[PDB]
């Protein structure tokens, strides 16, 4: 129930709260990322793509990023976020 | 509530009123309305047996905070047995006269009906109807029927 | 002589021992669970939004055209026609649910294309024919035409060099060489049953021929034939055996025909009556008048004893391919299939493993191959050793097949 | 006007009725068992009576009914409909068959595989009455049928069908046809051009799905 | 294309319970008074922030004239229909509940890309026109079986079963949390698990502890739940059960008391026996039959195992068979230790008195002993619990199992 506060910026909490990784928040972010919601200047949501991977200690999270990189080559324009 | 009946206007199919007393065509036998039954003191000589039933039925309902402070789970299962003609059914009716609670009478042989699957599921519909009257006591008549082996 | 309750003695209990934090900790837990509720009805954000398009394209339609398509547009129904009479319409039309009317044609029709048995658009007030329709196609056979390749090659059905050889003769060879049968003067069989122990490879042979078919292949869900209404399941049989006659040489695979009828009895005067009507309708469109021609039927079961002798007759089911256990050369080939794509030691032997699985199936052999890698994750390894498999045999077979013969073994050495 | 076939389900019940439709021109009307069962109420008695009124319009027309036991069952009482339309389709068959006098022109043929489903007191007098049972082929009737279906192949002329009836026993007519089909493909395995007595003997074991090894008892 | 339909556009809804499972003092200490007041602070602020959220909204446009006339364009008694075929000239055919079929039009703002014969739609009464399309279409018998609450405590609740705790974790938790080990050997994790053994051992606890500590969703099935009387209603609910589990999260399904769902598949003389036997034969088909499976795990549990259908016991369907035997003289100490956590224990007692002297009794027996001995303290006006409570309790619980077997033949 937000607007500019939520759908632009409020994912940097998860890019600041922990860097350990656990599938509660690691799966809650692609609920709002696989739904890109492209009507906004989508690099707001693609900024939330960027530090979604602000969790260190390497993991099995390659399943999310490479599959979103596959839809991210053609769509989610490679001019901006490749 | 989901799975609840409502009053629907035939004018424009507008909702009118939430209708209570949910679908249950077989609580005629259960929850007997009147209890002008026998009393508590005409049992006469089963005092060891009677006081144990206070510990399991009266005491958790009247004072649940004792089991909180003592730190144990509360009991819920009672079995009554013996030779025939030894006061097994008075003690059901004596409790039902003094329970200050919902009393659900189920004899132990009407859970078969005639069609498979509906002869079972009303048992599931029985106990979920006991959640409505949130304190309740449900009684079994003569489990030498279903429950054997 | 044991009684220890009186209302004054109740007040002893709940004041002795932590009178400070008893209710102080309790109602904090109580009203927060109340507050778990009061957040939920304050949210109320269920939002079952559906039906709507993206709201940037329909703007042209819902300006006036939607209001223009309320009153002039029609709520006409579709029906079926029995016949017609000469010099006039005299059209006799049924609904099969409503009544049967005798009505007139309208002005917007051509009186030639009002052929019999045709779906036609019918007015609601005076019930005149307006628009004829294309014929109805059955909606659920379209759901079960597979249109999809499951990826199993014949190189994964090892241990069955002769059962595939029998199955290659019936299905594949008349569809690719329909010459040597005629040029010698024989006819191929048209029905093959598969029977044997479970987990032996029934589904694999059906899954692998769906790969290499180059033809129409129809999976049939067995319990769709059983319905709630009387005679509905028998009508589903008919639509299946009509469209197979339209195209040439379509394959139909049933599976677990134990469920759709195994025996015909009546002693208690009742029972599985509606199942028998669907099952006997299957028989009369299998043999009888009007033989089917190029329709091949494959069936598979685990319990072949309990089937009807009306289906056991050749002419309906002609070849009885059975699956057995692989002796030793089969199993040594099976281990090389299910363990080639896993990180193992490159020096182990598999013939010693095929000894220790005397009466085993292809499913049990694969379970040993999966379990041996699970022991490698119990330790910290990335390749499988010989003792990884040897513990896996004892885990799968010897933990359930024998418990008296292994410790007290000294009758046999 | 009533002829009933019965027997074991491999003897040629449908095979006999197709030849009678073949050589005679008298407006053959086929009819199956479960065709009379419909979903809505009272539709089967419509389908029963309209076909009988159709077969009355043609004079020489005769009617064949296959799997009469699909509806000809011991009627039982109920409370949830179910079978309580089938007897209305059954009695309409019983009312129409006693509806007309037995003047031979609309002779009716029926055939079932099991007798013990049918209603015996419901036929018994002037209904389906003539009993034509189909027994299993004895010895030479097996050797006749195996000679019939082997008409279209290259049989080498050292094969006695009487020698085949020695080893083939308790078979119906269709299993005798199945030996004839499978023997043609065993010769196709090794690419043989004609058949032999050994080719049939392996085709016999394939019908009941047998196979033989070296059993190390038999020297 | 390569990524056709982008896999059904569908998210997952997991549980909302387990707000803070850290009440770890486990006693009347000020920490638990301090910890729970912190939870009171955040939920009150979450209340007041969303209270300010529906308060300070001066935005009104309603729908900028577009959806507002659309909500008046559609009828107010919105009805439910069913597609039969698609005549794509913006004039299609539908079917009602009775089967009255109508040549209706499409009254816009519906993309003709997610409507298939079988998908239920939304209709009018005055013109019966297609207004929307009904989504999710779940029959309300399977939504009852969708668990929303984590009922009990975690793996530290049960009293020591660690050889078999590590077994079920290999097939449920570890493949979902860390599936990097399995790709290094290409081995798919096991799917089916049977829990079997004598009653009163811990079968129902082990499912509840998994349903507590999980991330995917959870489905419970109580035995004779998928049994109806309409001869096709039985197997039809099983299809919708696995359909919902497949459409949602990569989740697990717990079907308990499967001894009433399988016995050796014999053929007999009763007609109601077959609709029993047929529903239980197509569960076999949905489990490991055709097509594939998806990421759906199945956990099954009985008391007796030998009276089951051997078609279900085979691998491919169930890859783990787990015995739950009656306890020992070592892990039984952990049973008595946990069930005597928050009770006032007098220092006279020895836990090893009742353990070593008697060597037969379940874990559910031990919970009954701890509750009965607590009732004996109030029976003789006490708070602390001594040895004499456990002397009378160990008697009174165990007198429900018969005297013995054979006499001294063996020696
Ligand atoms: N201790 C008792 N005091 C007074 N009346 C008793 C006593 N025991 C039995 N009765 C009499 O027995 C009858 C009730 O039967 P009871 O409650 O024993 O059921 P039951 O005989 O145990 O059931 P069943 O017939 O199945 O064994 C009543 O008439 C009651 O007055
Ligand atoms: N001959 C074989 N070669 C290789 N793998 C096999 C063989 N037989 C079985 N398997 C393996 O066993 C698994 C299960 O086999 P499958 O379920 O097809 O047996 P089934 O006979 O169809 O079972 P059911 O009789 O219950 O339908 C398959 O996935 C396959 O990998
Ligand atoms: N006496 C016979 N002469 C020639 N061929 C026969 C004979 N009996 C059986 N057959 C062959 O066996 C097959 C079985 O005959 P048919 O199709 O009539 O089956 P049926 O006995 O009517 O089966 P059901 O009684 O179960 O309907 C026929 O196709 C036919 O080719
Ligand atoms: N190992 C254990 N540790 C702690 N408590 C246990 C243990 N085993 C059983 N319990 C107790 O048993 C109860 C759970 O019963 P359990 O899970 O054994 O039922 P079940 O195995 O499904 O029985 P049934 O098979 O008869 O339905 C819990 O209340 C718990 O206190
Ligand atoms: Mg009594
Ligand atoms: Mg199979
Ligand atoms: Mg026939
Ligand atoms: Mg249990």
Q: For the residues of E105-165, what is the DSSP string, one character each? A: EB-SS--TTS--TT-EEEE-SSS--B-EE------TTTSTTB--S--S--TTSS---HHHH
Q: D82-85 long-range contacts, Cβ below 8 Å, gap at least 24? A: D82/C230, D82/C273, D82/C274, D83/C270, D83/C273, D85/C230, D85/D41, D85/D42, D85/D44
Contacts of E323 (CB under 8 A, 6+ apart): E164, E196, E197
Strands B15-19, B102-107: pairing is: unpaired
DSSP tag of C198: T
Question: C329 in helix, strand or coil?
Answer: helix
Q: Please answer yes or no on whether D73 and C322 come within 8 Å at the CB atom.
A: no
CB pairs below 8 Å between C and E: how many?
A: 230
Identify which of D37, D69, D152 has the shortest CB distance to residue C185.
D152
CB-based contact D188 C180, cutoff 8 Å: yes
Structure tokens at D24: 């005679």
List, in order, residues 6 or more apart from D73 with CB less than 8 Å away.
Answer: C266, C273, D83, D86, D117, D118, D119
Of C10, C22, C26, the CB nearest to B63: C10
* Helix C202-209, helix C163-170: angle, nearest 10: 40
Backbone angles phi, psi at B35, to 5 degrees: -130, 80
Angle value at C-alpha C261, between C259 and C266, nearest 5 degrees: 130
Residues C111/C95, Cβ–Cβ less than 8 Å: no
Token pair, residue E70, equals: 């659309």
Strand ranges, E, within C247-338: 250-253, 295-300, 319-322
Our CA dihedral for E156, E161, E165, E168, rounded to 10 degrees, sits at: -130
Q: How far apart are the first and last CA of chain B?
A: 39
What's the CA gap between C403 and C405, in Å, rounded? Answer: 6
Q: How many angstroms separate the first and last alpha carbons of chain A? A: 31
Distance (Å, whole) CA D94 – CA D88: 10
Instruction: Give the separation between CA E349 and CA E374, rounded to whole angstroms.
Output: 14
CB D75 within 8 A of CB C268: no
Helix E272-288 to helix E233-247 angle (10° resolution) is: 20
Mark D37-65 as b/e (b = at least 16 C-beta within 10 Å).
bbeeeebbbebbbebbeebeeeeebbbbb
Closest-approaching ligand to the CA atom of D8: 3
Whose CA is closest to E87, among E104, E70, E101?
A: E104
* The residue to which tokens 């003389």 are assigned: E269
Contacts from E90-93 at CB under 8 Å and sequence distance 24+?
A: E92/E130, E93/C78, E93/C133
End-to-end CA distance of chain C: 70
* Residue B86 known to bind ligand: yes
Q: Which of E291, E164, E169, E189 is nearest to E239 (CA)?
A: E291
Location of structure tokens 């053959």:
D28
Rounded distance between C-alpha atoms, residue E401 and residue D215, angstroms: 55
Eight-state DSSP code of residue E61: -
User: Which residue ranges of C are tagged as binding site for ATP?
Assistant: 196-203
- D12 burial (CB, 10 Å; 0-12 / 13-18 / 19+) is middle
**Nearest alpha carbon to residue E280 among B73, B108, B83, C223:** C223
Question: Nearest CA to C140 among E84, E38, E385, E230?
Answer: E84
Q: What is the largest CA-CA distance in chain B?
A: 67
- Compute the distance between CA of residue B17 and CA of residue B9 in angstroms, rounded to an integer: 9
Q: Long-range contacts made by residues E171-179, C-beta under 8 angstroms, separation at least 24?
A: E171/E297, E171/E319, E171/E320, E172/E210, E172/E214, E172/E252, E172/E297, E172/E299, E173/E210, E173/E213, E173/E214, E176/A23, E176/E215, E176/E216, E176/E250, E177/A23, E177/E215, E178/A59, E178/A60, E179/A60
**Dist CA D84 CA D87 (whole Å):** 6
Residue of E209, E254, E361, E364 with the most ligand 4 atoms within 8 Å of its CB, for mutation:
E364
Q: Which residues pair with E81 in a beta bridge?
A: E121
CA C110 from chain center: how many Å? 46
Which residue in chain C has the smallest CA separation from D211? C322
Dihedral of the alpha carbons of D127, D133, D134, D135, in degrees to the nearest 10: 160
The residue behind tokens 């008048």 is: C289
- How many C-beta neighbours within 10 Å does residue D7 have? 19
- Closest by CA to C51, choosing from E110, E71, E112, is E110
For A55-73, give one letter per residue: b (16+ CB within 10 A) or e.
beeebbeeebeeebeeebe
- Would you call C185 and D78 a contact, using CB atoms and an 8 Å cutoff? no
**Structure resolution, Å:** 4.1
Under a CB-based contact definition with an 8 Å cutoff, are residues D156 and D31 in contact?
no
**Cα(D176)–Cα(D147) distance, integer angstroms:** 10
Cβ distance B75 to E371 less than 8 Å, yes or no, reads yes
For testing the chain B interface, which of C13, C15, C21, C46 should be mutated: the one with the most B CBs within 10 Å? C13
Q: Are E92 and E130 in contact (CB under 8 A)?
A: yes
Rounded to the nearest 10 degrees, the angle between the axes of helix D43-57 and helix D86-97 is 20
Centre a 10 Å sphere on the Cβ of residue E333 and count the other Cβ atoms it contains. 16
Q: Is D128 left (phi over 0), alpha (psi -120 to 50) or beta?
A: beta
**Contact by Cβ (8 Å): C339, C376:** no
User: φ, ψ for residue C203 (rounded to 5)?
Assistant: -70, -30
Q: How far apart are CA C386 and CA C350, in angstroms?
A: 10
Ligand 6 center to E252 CA (angstroms): 23
Ligand 3 binding pocket, CB closer than 6 Å: C 287, 310, 315; D 9-15, 113, 145, 148, 173-174, 177
Name which of E204, E214, E201, E211 is nearest E160 in CA terms.
E201
Sequence-distant (≥ 6) Cβ neighbours of residue C219 within 8 angstroms: C144, C146, C253, C255, E290
Residue C14 near residue C22, CB atoms below 8 Å: yes
Query: Rounded distance, CA E251 to CA E294, Å?
Result: 10
Q: Which helix (H) or strand (E) holds C355?
A: helix C351-355
The distance in angstroms from the start CA to the end CA of chain D is 64
Residue B102 labelled as part of a binding site: no
> Is D172–C186 a contact, with Cβ atoms under 8 angstroms apart?
no
**Which tokens go with A51?**
């530090």
In sequence order, the 6+-apart residues with CB closer than 8 A to the CB of E366 are E332, E335, E336, E339
Atom 24, ligand 3: which residue's CA is nearest?
Answer: D9
- Give me the residue label for tokens 């709507």: C52
Q: Chains with ≥3 Cβ pairs under 8 A against D?
A: C
The angle at the Cα of E294, spanning E289 to E297, to the nearest 5 degrees, equals 85
Of B7, B3, B28, which is closest to residue B18 (Cα–Cα)?
B7
Question: Residue by residue, what is the 3-state secondary structure of C133-173?
Answer: CCCCCCCCHHHHECCCCCCCCHHHCCCCCCHHHHHHHHCHH
For the CA atoms of C109, C110, C113, C117, the dihedral, rounded to the nearest 10 degrees, stands at 30
**Which residue among C270, C280, C318 sits closest to D70, beta carbon to beta carbon?**
C280
CA–CA dist C321, C205 (Å, integer): 11
Going by the DSSP 8-state scheme, the letter that residue D1 receives in this structure is: -
Do E101 and E95 form a contact (C-beta atoms < 8 A)? Answer: yes
Report CA dihedral (E98, E103, E108, E111) to the nearest 10 degrees.
80
* HSE-up (13 A, CA, CB side) for residue C75: 14
CB-based contacts of B50, cutoff 8 Å, min separation 6: B43, B91
Counting ligand 2 atoms within 8 A of each CB, the residue from C161, C204, C210 with the most, and so the one to mutate, is C204
Burial letters E262-283, b for 16+ CB under 10 A, else e: beebeeeeebbebbbbbbbbbb
Q: What DSSP character marks residue B75?
A: P
Cα separation, B52 vs B67, in Å, equals 16
CB contact under 8 A, E3 and A1: no
Query: Are residues B117 and E343, on separate chains, in Cβ contact within 8 Å?
Result: no
Enter the tokens of residue D144.
């006749």
- Is ligand 1 within 6 A of the CB of residue B45? yes
Q: A with B: 3 or more CB pairs under 8 Å?
A: no
Residues near ligand 4 with C-beta < 6 Å? E 158-159, 161, 199-205, 303, 335, 338, 363-364, 367
Residue D131's SS3 state is: strand
Of ligand 2's listed atoms, the one at least distance from the Cα of C323 is 21
Closest CA to C157 of C330, C21, C24, C315: C330
For E47, the token pair is 């209340």
CA C376/CA E181 separation, integer angstroms: 10
Cβ neighbors of E187 (< 8 A, separation 6 or more) are C342, C369, C370, C373, C374
Q: Tell me phi and psi for residue B53, to 5 degrees.
A: -75, -30
Nearest-10 crossing angle of helices D197-207, D173-189: 120
**E window 103-122, beta carbon within 8 A of C:** 103-105, 107-111, 117-118, 122
Q: What is the CA radius of gyration of chain A?
A: 12
Atom 6 of ligand 3, residue of closest alpha carbon: D173
Tell me which H or E stretch contains E321.
strand E320-323
Q: How far is CA B119 from CA E139, E225, E228, in A?
A: 21, 12, 9
Q: What angle do CA C282, C284, C289 make, to 5 degrees?
A: 150
Which residues, other chains included, contact B14 with Cβ-Cβ below 8 Å and sequence gap of 6+?
Answer: B8, E76
Q: Which residue has the tokens 């007759």?
A: C313
Output the CA–CA distances (angstroms, integers) from residue D2 to B137, D105, E75, in the order listed: 68, 12, 62
Q: How far from D105 is each of D55, D99, E170, CA to CA, in Å?
A: 10, 14, 78
Q: Cα A22 to chain center, whole Å?
A: 15
Ligand 8 mean position, distance from CA B111 (Å): 21
From residue E208, give the alpha-carbon distance in Å to each of A18, E241, E320: 29, 20, 19
Which residues lie below 8 Å from residue C259, measured CB to CB, with a gap of 6+? C222, C223, C226, E278, E281, E282
Least Cα separation, residue C19 to chain E (angstroms): 10
Nearest one of C136, A33, C267 to D73, comparing CA atoms: C267
Q: Are strands E218-222 and E120-123 parallel, antiparallel or unpaired?
A: unpaired
- Asked whether D199 and D192 are in contact (CB, 8 A), the reply is yes
Gap from CA of C366 to ligand 2 centroid (Å): 9
Query: Measured between CA atoms, how close is B105 to chain E, in angstroms?
Result: 23
Reduced to 3 states (helix: H, G, I; strand: E, B; else coil), residue D204 is helix
Is the Cβ atom of B84 under 6 angstroms away from ligand 1?
yes
Measured between alpha carbons, how far is D89 from D86 in angstroms, rounded to an integer? 5
| Contact criterion met (CB below 8 Å) for B38 and B97 | yes
Chain breaks in chain B (C to N over 2.5 A) after: none
Say whether residue E61 is in contact with chain A using an 8 A CB cutoff: no
| Cβ–Cβ under 8 Å, residues C67 and C73 | no
Alpha-carbon gap, residue A23 to A11, rounded angstroms = 15
The CA distance from E7 to the nearest CA of chain A, in Å, is: 11
Experimental technique of record: cryo-EM
C–D interface: beta-carbon pairs under 8 A: 100
* Rounded alpha-carbon distances, angstroms, from residue E48 to A10, C46, E16: 19, 20, 20
What is the Cα–Cα distance from C86 to E376, expressed in whole angstroms? 100
**Residue E35 structure tokens:** 């910890």
Chain B adjacent subunits, 3+ CB pairs under 8 A: C, E
Pocket of ligand 2 (CB under 6 A): C 156-160, 198-204, 302, 334, 337, 362-363, 366; E 288, 311, 316
**Alpha-carbon gap, residue E287 to E276, rounded angstroms:** 18
Please give the full DSSP string across D5-53, using - where no structure is assigned.
Answer: EESSTTS-HHHHHHHHHHH--S-EEEE-SGGG--SSTTHHHHHHHHHHH
For residue E88, report the phi and psi dihedrals to the nearest 5 degrees.
Answer: -85, 20
What is the rounded CA–CA span in Å between residue D21 and residue C411?
72
Residue of E242, E236, E336 whose CA lies nearest to E279: E236
Judge: C277–D32 Cβ closer than 8 Å, yes or no. no
Rounded to a whole number of angstroms, the CA Rg of chain D reads 23
| DSSP state for residue C78 in the 8-state scheme | E
The secondary element (H helix, E strand) that includes residue C218 is strand C216-219
Do residues E265 and E311 make contact, with C-beta atoms less than 8 angstroms apart? yes
Q: Exposed, middle or buried, A25 (CB in 10 Å: 0-12/13-18/19+)?
A: middle
Give distance in angstroms: CA of C321 to centre of ligand 3.
23
Chain C, 138 to 167: residues with Cβ < 8 Å from chain D are: none
Contacts of C284 in chain D (CB under 8 A): 32-34, 66-67
Q: Which two tokens stand for residue D69?
A: 């036991």
Q: Which of C230, C225, E229 minimizes the C-alpha distance to D41? A: C230
């Amino acid at each position: 129930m937000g607007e500019e506060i939520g759908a632009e910026m409020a994912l940097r909490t998860f890019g600041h709260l922990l860097r350990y990784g656990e599938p509660t928040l690691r799966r809650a972010v692609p609920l709002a990322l696989a739904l890109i919601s492209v009507s906004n200047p989508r690099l707001n949501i693609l900024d939330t793509l960027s530090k979604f991977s602000h969790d260190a200690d390497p993991e099995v999270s390659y399943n999310s990023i490479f599959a979103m990189g596959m839809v991210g080559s053609g769509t989610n324009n490679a001019r901006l976020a490749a | 509530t989901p799975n609840c009946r409502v009053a629907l206007r035939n004018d424009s199919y507008t909702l009118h009123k939430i209708l209570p007393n949910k679908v249950d065509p077989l609580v005629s036998l259960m929850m007997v309305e009147k209890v002008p039954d026998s009393t508590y003191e005409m049992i006469g000589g089963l005092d060891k047996q009677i006081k144990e039933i206070k510990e399991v039925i009266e005491l958790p309902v009247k004072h649940p905070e004792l089991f909180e402070a003592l730190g144990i789970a509360q009991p819920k299962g009672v079995l009554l047995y013996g030779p025939p003609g030894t006061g097994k059914t008075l003690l059901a009716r004596a409790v039902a006269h003094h329970t200050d609670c919902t009393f659900i009478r189920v004899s132990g042989s009407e859970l078969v009906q005639k069609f498979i699957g509906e002869g079972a599921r009303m048992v599931r519909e029985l106990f979920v109807m006991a959640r409505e009257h949130a304190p309740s006591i449900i009684f079994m008549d003569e489990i030498d029927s279903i429950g054997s082996s | 002589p044991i009684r220890a309750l009186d209302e004054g003695d109740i007040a002893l209990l709940k004041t002795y021992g932590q009178s400070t934090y008893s209710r102080q900790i309790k109602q904090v837990e109580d009203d927060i669970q109340q507050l778990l509720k009061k957040i939920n009805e304050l949210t109320g954000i269920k939002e079952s939004d559906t039906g709507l398009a993206p709201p940037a394209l329909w703007d042209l339609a819902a300006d006036k055209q939607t209001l223009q398509s309320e009153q002039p547009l029609q709520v006409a129904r579709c029906t079926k026609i029995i016949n017609a009479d000469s010099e006039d319409p005299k059209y006799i039309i049924n609904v099969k649910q409503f009544a049967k009317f005798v009505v007139d044609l309208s002005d917007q029709v051509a009186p030639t294309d009002i052929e019999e048995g045709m779906r036609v658009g019918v007015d609601r007030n005076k019930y005149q024919i307006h628009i004829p329709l294309p014929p109805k196609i059955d909606p659920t056979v379209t759901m079960m035409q597979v249109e999809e390749k499951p990826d199993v090659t014949y190189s994964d059905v090892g241990g069955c060099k002769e059962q595939i050889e029998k199955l290659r003769e019936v299905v594949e060879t008349p569809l690719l060489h329909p010459e040597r049968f005629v040029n010698l003067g024989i006819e191929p069989p048209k029905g093959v049953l598969l029977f044997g122990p479970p987990g032996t490879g029934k589904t694999l042979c059906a899954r692998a021929v769906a790969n290499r078919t180059d033809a129409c292949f129809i999976r049939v869900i067995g319990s769709e034939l059983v319905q709630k209404y009387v005679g509905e399941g028998a009508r589903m049989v008919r639509e299946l055996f009509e469209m197979a006659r339209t195209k040439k040489a379509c394959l139909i695979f049933f599976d677990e025909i134990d469920a759709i009828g195994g025996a015909r009895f009546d002693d208690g005067a009742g029972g599985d009556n509606e199942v028998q009507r669907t099952m006997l309708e299957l028989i009369n469109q299998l043999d009888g008048f009007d033989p089917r021609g190029n329709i091949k039927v494959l069936m598979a079961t685990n319990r072949p004893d309990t089937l009807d002798p009306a289906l056991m007759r050749p002419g309906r089911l002609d070849r009885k391919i059975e699956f057995s256990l692989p002796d030793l050369e089969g199993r040594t080939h099976i281990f090389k299939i299910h363990a080639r794509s896993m990180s193992v030691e490159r020096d182990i032997r598999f013939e010693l493993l095929a000894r220790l699985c005397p009466n085993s199936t292809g499913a049990e052999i694969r379970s040993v191959c999966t379990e041996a890698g699970m022991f490698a994750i119990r330790a910290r390894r990335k390749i499988a050793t010989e003792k990884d498999f040897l513990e896996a045999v004892n885990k799968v077979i010897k933990s359930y097949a024998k418990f008296s013969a292994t410790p007290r073994y000294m009758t046999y050495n | 006007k009533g002829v009933l076939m019965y027997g074991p389900p491999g003897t040629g019940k449908t095979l006999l009725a197709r030849a009678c439709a073949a050589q005679t021109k008298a407006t053959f009307l086929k009819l199956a068992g479960p065709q009379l069962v419909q979903m809505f109420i009272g539709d089967g008695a419509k389908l029963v009576r309209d076909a009988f009124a159709l077969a009355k319009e043609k004079a020489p027309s005769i009617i064949f009914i296959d799997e009469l036991d699909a509806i000809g069952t011991k009627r039982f009482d109920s409370e949830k409909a179910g079978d309580r339309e089938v007897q209305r389709t059954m009695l309409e068959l019983l009312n129409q068959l006693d509806g007309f006098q037995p003047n031979t022109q609309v002779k009716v043929i029926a055939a079932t595989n099991r007798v013990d489903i049918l209603d015996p007191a419901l036929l018994r007098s002037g209904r389906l009455d003539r009993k034509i049972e189909f027994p299993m082929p004895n010895e030479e009737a097996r050797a006749r049928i195996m000679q019939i279906h082997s008409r279209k192949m290259n049989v080498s002329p050292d094969v006695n069908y009487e020698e085949l009836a020695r080893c083939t026993d308790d078979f119906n007519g269709a299993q005798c046809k199945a030996v004839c089909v499978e023997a043609g493909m065993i010769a196709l395995r090794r690419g043989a051009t004609e058949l032999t007595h050994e080719d049939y003997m392996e085709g016999i074991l394939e019908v009941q799905a047998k196979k033989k090894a070296n059993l190390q008892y038999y020297a | 294309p390569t990524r056709v339909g982008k896999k059904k556009k569908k998210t997952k809804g997991p549980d909302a319970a387990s707000k803070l499972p850290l009440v770890t003092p486990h006693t009347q200490c000020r920490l638990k008074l301090l910890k729970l007041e912190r939870i009171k602070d955040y939920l009150l602020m979450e209340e007041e922030f969303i209270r300010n959220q529906e308060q300070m909204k001066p935005l009104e446009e309603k729908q900028e004239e577009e959806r507002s006339k659309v909500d008046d364009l559609r009828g107010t008694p919105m009805s439910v229909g069913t597609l039969e075929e698609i005549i794509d000239d913006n004039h299609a055919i539908v079917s009602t509940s009775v089967g009255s079929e109508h040549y209706v039009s499409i009254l816009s703002f519906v993309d003709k890309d997610l409507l298939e014969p079988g998908c239920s739609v939304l209709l009018n009464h005055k013109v019966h026109a297609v207004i929307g399309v009904l989504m999710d279409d779940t029959d309300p018998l399977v939504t009852v079986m969708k668990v929303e609450k984590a009922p009990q405590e975690t793996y530290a609740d049960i009293g020591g079963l660690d050889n078999q705790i590590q077994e079920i974790k290999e097939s449920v938790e570890l493949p979902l949390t860390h599936p990097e080990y399995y790709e290094e050997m290409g081995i798919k994790p096991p799917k089916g698990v049977i829990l079997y053994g004598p009653p009163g051992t811990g079968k129902t606890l082990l499912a509840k502890a998994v349903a507590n500590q999980t991330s995917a969703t959870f489905l419970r099935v109580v035995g004779s739940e998928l049994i109806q009387k309409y001869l096709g209603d039985g197997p039809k609910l099983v299809r919708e059960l696995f359909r919902v589990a497949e459409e949602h999260a990569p989740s697990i399904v717990f079907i308990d008391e499967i001894d009433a769902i399988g016995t050796k598949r014999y053929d007999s003389n009763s007609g109601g026996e077959r609709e029993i036997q047929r529903t239980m034969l197509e569960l076999l088909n949905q489990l490991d039959g055709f097509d594939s499976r998806g990421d759906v795990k199945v956990i099954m549990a009985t008391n007796r195992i030998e009276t089951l259908d051997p078609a279900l016991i085979r691998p491919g369907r169930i890859d783990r068979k787990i015995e739950f035997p009656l306890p020992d003289e070592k892990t039984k100490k952990r049973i008595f230790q946990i069930h005597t956590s928050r009770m006032t224990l007098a220092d006279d007692v020895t836990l090893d008195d009742l353990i070593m002297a008697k060597d037969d009794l379940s874990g559910a027996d031990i919970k009954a002993i701890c509750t009965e001995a607590g009732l004996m303290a109030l029976r003789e006006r006490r708070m602390k619990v001594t040895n004499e409570d456990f002397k009378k309790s160990k008697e009174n619980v165990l007198y429900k199992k018969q005297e013995g077997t054979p006499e001294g033949l063996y020696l």
